[PDB]
């Protein structure tokens, strides 16, 4: 596989190049839920195009790709959200025409708790001054890691993931961090991925409660994304 022979610079370039577009949004509890889910559904189609550009992914069997995507889709959407919300303190930039604060979260039962977490995480990337090259590394780590254990095909993912670790370190080194700072920052970044899992899981169970209360009609793909989780 050619993914493993990439330099760090080429890994970063491929990643930046594969980035998905920023989409636009198309107020009751029901309408707001409608917006959020309609957005996610449209983003999902572009995420899939991105996944295929992530070095190593295309090397997996179609069933592994499905498993990884089904596991990680909402984590991927939320890290993107938190990234684009970074220079919007106290706000979540779901779309350039859908910029929401915690007061707009209280509109939906259980949603402000999720907003407050997404907002704390965005504030955390901000205090850490997370850089775009770091972001794309983290996002692809989520894709390859979240469904990996619940699977020599793993071995390949793990080599690919090791390569991404190297790239992250390289960026930190190039940026001028001390060797201790490097491993400290790597750990801080990876630990935040556990907060992103937490959030996906809460969002996932929330979406499922919205579905079961019949508050929003979900697309066939979203229903299928949600089934993989119960």
């Amino acid at each position: 596989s050619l993914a493993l022979s990439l330099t760090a610079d080429q890994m970063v370039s491929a990643l930046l190049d594969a980035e998905p577009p920023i989409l636009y949004s198309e107020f009751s509890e029901a309408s707001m839920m409608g917006l959020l889910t309609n957005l996610a559904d449209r983003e999902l189609v572009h995420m899939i195009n991105w996944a295929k550009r992530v070095p190593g992914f295309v090397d997996l069997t179609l069933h592994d790709q499905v498993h990884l995507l089904e596991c990680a889709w909402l984590e991927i959407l939320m890290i993107g959200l938190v990234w684009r919300s970074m220079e919007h303190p106290g706000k979540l930039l779901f779309a350039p025409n859908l910029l929401l604060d915690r007061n707009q979260g209280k509109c939906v039962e259980g949603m402000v708790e999720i907003f407050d977490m997404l907002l704390a995480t965005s504030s955390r990337f901000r205090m850490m001054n997370l850089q775009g090259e770091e972001f794309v590394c983290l996002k692809s780590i989520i894709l390859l890691n979240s469904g990996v254990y619940t699977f020599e095909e793993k071995d390949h993912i793990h080599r690919v993931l090791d390569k991404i670790t190297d790239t992250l370190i390289h960026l930190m080194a190039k940026a001028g961090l001390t060797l201790q700072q490097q491993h400290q920052r790597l750990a801080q970044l990876l630990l935040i991925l556990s907060h992103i899992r937490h959030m996906s899981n809460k969002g996932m169970e929330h979406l499922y409660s919205m579905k079961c209360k019949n508050v929003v009609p979900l697309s066939d793909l979203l229903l299928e994304m949600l089934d993989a989780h119960r």
Partner: peptide, 10 residues
């Protein structure tokens, strides 16, 4: 079959 499966083979 799965929409996801399908979207991936394009």
């Amino acid at each position: 079959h799965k929409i996801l499966h399908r979207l991936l083979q394009d």
